[PDB]
């Protein structure tokens, strides 16, 4: 017995927590990312990077804590603990926001390890690896949003902070500065996510309401056993119902479930392509025909032009606080505002 | 040299449901991207 | 409106090229 094959035996035992070869990448990296996030949201400030309190130690709550992005002065420095910024000082590393690339990098390598775990367990069990192919969507989202968006921007500062209200800030920032709702790549993402939620709800309700009477109890859940051969619900009845209700219906179970896979994964990939565009400020910010008309004609108003005005107001009122390294002094008279508010 | 028949030739199919799904996808992609094409 | 001069041709081709591809594939199916 070779030592590699003995180690392969030990790593792929049937235990409570499967390890595998992928676990050597997954578990230390996922533990580092999760412990870094919990450590930062419990103890670590954003006072020197953002001028903000973002830990439970400062009095923030679960909504208002974050592992915030590092200072804009560092650019896209990877901000290693031993790196030229922190210089080995753990306290300085915490204060300059090094927990953000710590969490983001270990998280990215843990996500790699998780899709590798999906591949490894799919190979061992003997099934096709479509769970890993489906998980390509979340990794596309993580790579485009937390990595390539700040890389395209000036620093890691403009990456989303690992927090609830920090993510809400990133979301509103992308509305006001990028017009990300107007981007068709995000619209395909929204369509994919709402379609995935629709398909989940409709598929579950259809199965639960086309169940076969396979038991004597009103509790229908005990009328199923996993080792049975026949279908637990009537695809014919479900097909007839949705054909007469909606006009069309699924007639193929395998196509139904591939579509349930396909819709949100494709939405995530499309929104990722849009975030890649936004990394370089390649926005769908404006419809130039409507601005040219609105500049020439003061009677022309659409909901698009109203959204443009909303974005301008948000940018001017948020940027001095959201980007304190820039020292944006906007006196009150230059702030755009409507009548009386 | 001789021009021999290739035995790796295989027919392509697209069923009617796939046609309808593709036509709807292409129509909604046109609906989505036409405003940006016009700008 | 002052639109892109190529917007009409891009929209018609973006719709019509894969429409044609799908119609070609559907009509030949069963051969």
């Amino acid at each position: 017995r070779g030592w590699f094959d003995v180690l392969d035996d030990w790593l792929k035992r049937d235990r409570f927590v499967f390890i595998g070869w992928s676990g050597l990448l997954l578990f230390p990296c996922a533990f580092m990312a999760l412990g870094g996030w919990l450590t930062g949201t419990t103890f670590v400030t954003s006072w020197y990077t953002h001028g903000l309190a973002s830990s439970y130690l400062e009095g923030a709550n679960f909504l208002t804590v974050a592992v915030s992005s590092p200072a804009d002065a560092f650019g896209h420095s990877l901000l290693f603990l031993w790196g030229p910024e922190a210089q080995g000082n753990l306290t300085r590393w915490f204060q300059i926001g090094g927990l953000w690339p710590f969490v983001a990098l270990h998280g990215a390598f843990g996500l790699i390890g998780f899709m590798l775990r999906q591949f490894e367990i799919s190979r061992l069990v003997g099934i096709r690896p479509y769970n890993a192919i489906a998980f390509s969507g979340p990794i596309a989202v993580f790579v485009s949003v937390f990595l390539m968006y700040p890389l395209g921007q000036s620093s890691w500062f403009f990456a989303p902070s690992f927090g609830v209200a920090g993510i809400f800030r990133f979301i509103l920032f992308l509305q006001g500065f990028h017009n990300w709702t107007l981007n068709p790549f995000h619209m395909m993402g929204v369509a994919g996510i709402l379609g995935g939620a629709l398909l989940c709800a409709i598929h579950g309700a259809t199965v639960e309401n086309t169940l076969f009477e396979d038991g004597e109890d009103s509790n229908t859940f005990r009328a199923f056993e996993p080792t049975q051969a026949e279908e637990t619900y009537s695809m014919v009845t479900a097909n007839r119902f949705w054909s007469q209700i909606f006009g069309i219906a699924f007639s193929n179970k395998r196509w139904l479930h591939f579509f349930m896979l396909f819709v949100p994964v494709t939405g995530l990939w499309m929104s990722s392509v849009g975030i890649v565009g936004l990394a370089l400020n390649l926005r769908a910010y404006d419809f130039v025909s409507q601005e040219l008309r609105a500049a020439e004609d003061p009677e022309f108003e659409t909901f698009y032009t109203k959204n443009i005005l909303l974005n301008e107001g948000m940018r001017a009122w948020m940027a001095p606080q959201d980007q304190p390294h820039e020292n944006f002094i906007f006196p009150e008279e230059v702030l755009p505002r409507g009548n009386a508010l | 040299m001789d021009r021999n028949s290739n035995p790796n030739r295989q027919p392509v199919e697209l069923n009617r449901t796939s046609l309808y799904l593709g036509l709807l996808l292409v129509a909604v992609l046109g609906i989505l991207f036409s405003s940006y094409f016009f700008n | 409106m002052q639109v892109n001069n190529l917007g009409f041709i891009a929209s018609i081709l973006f719709v019509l090229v894969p429409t044609v591809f799908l119609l070609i594939l559907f009509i030949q199916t069963g051969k």
Partner: peptide, 30 residues
């Protein structure tokens, strides 16, 4: 003239919806 293009693409989607309902491949038990 962009209004014609918008009307055509919306009409193509609605025609696809009609032909997919009215002229679907019928689901057959076999």
């Amino acid at each position: 003239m962009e209004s014609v293009a918008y009307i055509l693409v919306l009409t193509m989607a609605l025609a696809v919806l009609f032909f997919a309902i009215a002229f679907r491949e019928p689901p057959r038990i076999e």
